[PDB]
Ligand binder design. Sequence first.
Ligand SMILES: [Zn+2]
Lengths: 87, 46, 67, 139, 232, 53, 293, 36, 20, 16, 34, 48
Amino acid sequence: LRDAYTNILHIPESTQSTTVLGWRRSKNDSPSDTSIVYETVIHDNDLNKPKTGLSEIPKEIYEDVVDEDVLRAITEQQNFEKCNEYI
Amino acid sequence: QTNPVPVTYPTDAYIPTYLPDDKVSNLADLKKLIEMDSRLDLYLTR
Amino acid sequence: SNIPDPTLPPTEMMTRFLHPNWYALPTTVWLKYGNYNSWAPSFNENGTVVDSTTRGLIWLERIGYMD
Amino acid sequence: SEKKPIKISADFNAKAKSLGLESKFSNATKTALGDPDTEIRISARISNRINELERLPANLGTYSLDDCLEFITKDDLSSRMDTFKIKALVELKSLKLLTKQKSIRQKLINNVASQAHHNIPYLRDSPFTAAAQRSVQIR
Amino acid sequence: YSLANFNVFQSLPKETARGVDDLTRMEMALLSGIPEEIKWSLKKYLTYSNKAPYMISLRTLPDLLPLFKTFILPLERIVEGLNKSSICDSKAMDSLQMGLNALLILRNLAQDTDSVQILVKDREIKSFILFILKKFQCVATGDNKWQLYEGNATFFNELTHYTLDLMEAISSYIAPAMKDDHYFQTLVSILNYTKDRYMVISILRSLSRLLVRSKANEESAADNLDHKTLSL
Amino acid sequence: SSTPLNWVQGPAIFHMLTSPYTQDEIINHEMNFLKGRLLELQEITGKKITGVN
Amino acid sequence: NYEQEAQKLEEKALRFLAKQTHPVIIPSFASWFDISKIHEIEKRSNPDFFNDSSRFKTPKAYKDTRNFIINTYRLSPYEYLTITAVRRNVAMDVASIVKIHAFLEKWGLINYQIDPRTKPSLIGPSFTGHFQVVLDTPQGLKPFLPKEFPVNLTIKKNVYDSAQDFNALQDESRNSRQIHKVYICHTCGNESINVRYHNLRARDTNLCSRCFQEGHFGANFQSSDFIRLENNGNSVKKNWSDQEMLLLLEGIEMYEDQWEKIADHVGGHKRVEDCIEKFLSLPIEDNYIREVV
Amino acid sequence: NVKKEFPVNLTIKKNVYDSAQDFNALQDESRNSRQI
Amino acid sequence: SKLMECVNDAVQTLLQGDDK
Amino acid sequence: SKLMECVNDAVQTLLQ
Amino acid sequence: AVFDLMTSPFTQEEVLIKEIDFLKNKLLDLQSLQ
Amino acid sequence: SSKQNELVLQGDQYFNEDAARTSDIYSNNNNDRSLMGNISLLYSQGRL
Ligand SMILES: [Zn+2]
């Protein structure tokens, strides 16, 4: 939908990406090959498991009433999200 | 003369004051001698 | 063109070239007040790069022991 | 070998040499291109080469041995007749524009040296260069 | 060939064609925190203080002194830590050099009336000057508390000089010095110690300016001048 | 803007090709630059200067 | 299986990706800024959104508003992005909108007015490599899956020869042979096609192939005064043929210091910097210096 | 977060020791008395 | 000037250890 | 070669 | 020489006068040095 | 300090009329290109 106040397209934010997970750099094939290769890349560590707000619940809520396995699952989910926030 | 004539060799030097007073025992005598030399210079020039 | 022949002198490039790494930095001045004026300011170190004692040590190493 | 491998003395030219810093007290190094003899010799060689290049004929076509696939019929023009002529001209003109290249090179070198203390980090950041640049700006 | 060839683009001012006036550029660069911009802006500010100090006078441009103070107080901490080898890292050297540049800029500006009037009304700068003077006195009298490590002497040297110049200026605005004044004692100690000539003349001017409006019968700073100093 | 400002083409700052870090060459080239700039500005403005040598 | 999944994912991600057309320019002191992070300078200049004072002022709201403004500006960097448009789109109190807009404008992050056709282009230390900006994968485009599944796709690529090409946003694809040049026989008005016979003495008059075959030049010139050159032949970047080097030397001989005319005499498809570099790095004298020493 | 040398145009140059082996285009028709 | 590289490496190894 | 030998011998004598 | 566009509550005339004053004093000092 | 002083003492080695008269330091094959990279700027300033 083209908005007229700013004269600019508006697409649902889902189709767009949110953040930028750092950069990556390498070298050319030959020395003195002074060229720049700029390119974008998407990264989707463990696309099977969805993300939830579980990295936000403080420890002082779910603790002390949980099974060992559920505690391990909670920790795994939180660590998974935190690591997916990386490169 | 109205100016001190800049020269090429060092004309003086500080004496280090960070040496241990126990180990070096002849700094006081050297400073006394320097003071007496300054006094003699003052008296002669006056 | 006005370009001369490559065999005509001069032919050297860095004949009067001076790199900044040799530009004669400022140092102490070493004034001299007569002969019996010992209570007198000997140095004049206002815009120096290195202090007086280090300049004196440089002079001692390079010049004072040349003999 | 067994004992101390340095043996510092009171010379300061053997002492400085034994620890690596030998040329670091001279203004500029010693090179070979600074004598008029070598300059005269190089100039002689260059003049000889230019003489040889100029004594070549103008009509200096080249048969390229790949003209077989180009079925030339004594009326067409071979697309490679000027390949040795172009090289001869390039070499001759490059040999005649030597002083121009020298001048531009020395201009570049001077204009990049004068700004060493302002463009090179490890020179701009030493305490001595900073102290000197401060000393110049003392009001 | 290019969309700039519209009539609309025929009326652009000359003030923005470069992007930002250099004063604004230097201010924002100091505000950023990026070290390269900091060094560039400090070099430019120093050149301006030396060759055009009326464009950056501390009166016409307020909120200029706070930035210099932010660069100058860590210099106080460093100088306190200067009695041993403590400039091992390059960030330490960079902070020290930024402090020295800001101090020289302050001195060059203090060579003017409005700027020194603004500088006097600042407790931080006066406290820093007093701190450096007390360190110099500790070096001069040969105290065992704080002994300068000679590997740093160079730095200290420059430091001292700038400080004294500053003192000289502000010496006119603390004119009547009382009995137990630390400035006077520090200056007389340094005067009895030093062998520099620039330093001796500066100290004499500073002392003669700290005795402007003082009474003979009233107890003043002139009672801190023992017969040794007068004889000298 | 509570303080009206103007666009002021600032003053020429002395810039030497080779900065030699000592006062001799600097003072020579700087006296030359000062005299030249004084002449330029006296030509620009309707005024006169004293002590120009 | 997963191959088709990643293929469709790349297709969808490339379809809904914002293609850049205009270059964005910001002043150097605004180099601490990242679109996905908040800096200390932003928290000092905007203490109200982070001191937990109000509920209407949260760091999330501030970040969303400033990202809206940044994206809106970057998508059309030629316009001015008045405050009223933002206020009509964003749902904050007008004071906060104004403060954020003014803060972003002070640091040149938006509405930075230059005329970039009056400044040179340089090269930073970081240069000459492959740079991969890795941005998170968009949701609503992930596949529907009713074992791991990592993804490290690459959406679009761009190559540049110099930094000036990077700034002008000119890729090698279209830049290679963008336009052409026309030569005309000095004797007949007809234009020479695919080949011209350059006069080594006149250095300005070129001839048709036919007018050279039949000797239709002046009676003081011989056939040995002309040389065969090509017209449509452009060399790949950083590759100088012998014809181009000869033309460069002739241009330097004719126009001694007028490097625009020189670079045009070579054929125009090479910038002036390349001409100066090629003339500088030329082992003209190395053999004789080496054999004497 | 190699030495490229000037081309050695050997086909252009002449033999230094026995110049009777150059290509006929480079020879001088003056040693066999064929100038005029 | 090659001895000083070994000396610097020795000093670095000294800085690596703890009870040295 | 022998330089590393001398340096390591000196360091070992220093640390012992 | 280098010219830097700037902004100040002054005008061009007053700035030129201040520059004249400062440069005159500086030239007098440099002359008195020798 | 040793690393920094060694870096400083190696700042003027290619300024001796041997590196200047031969095409080595002007070649692009140099990994460090701190010399040729200036050309553009030097051309825009007209000094060159
Ligand atoms: Zn024709």
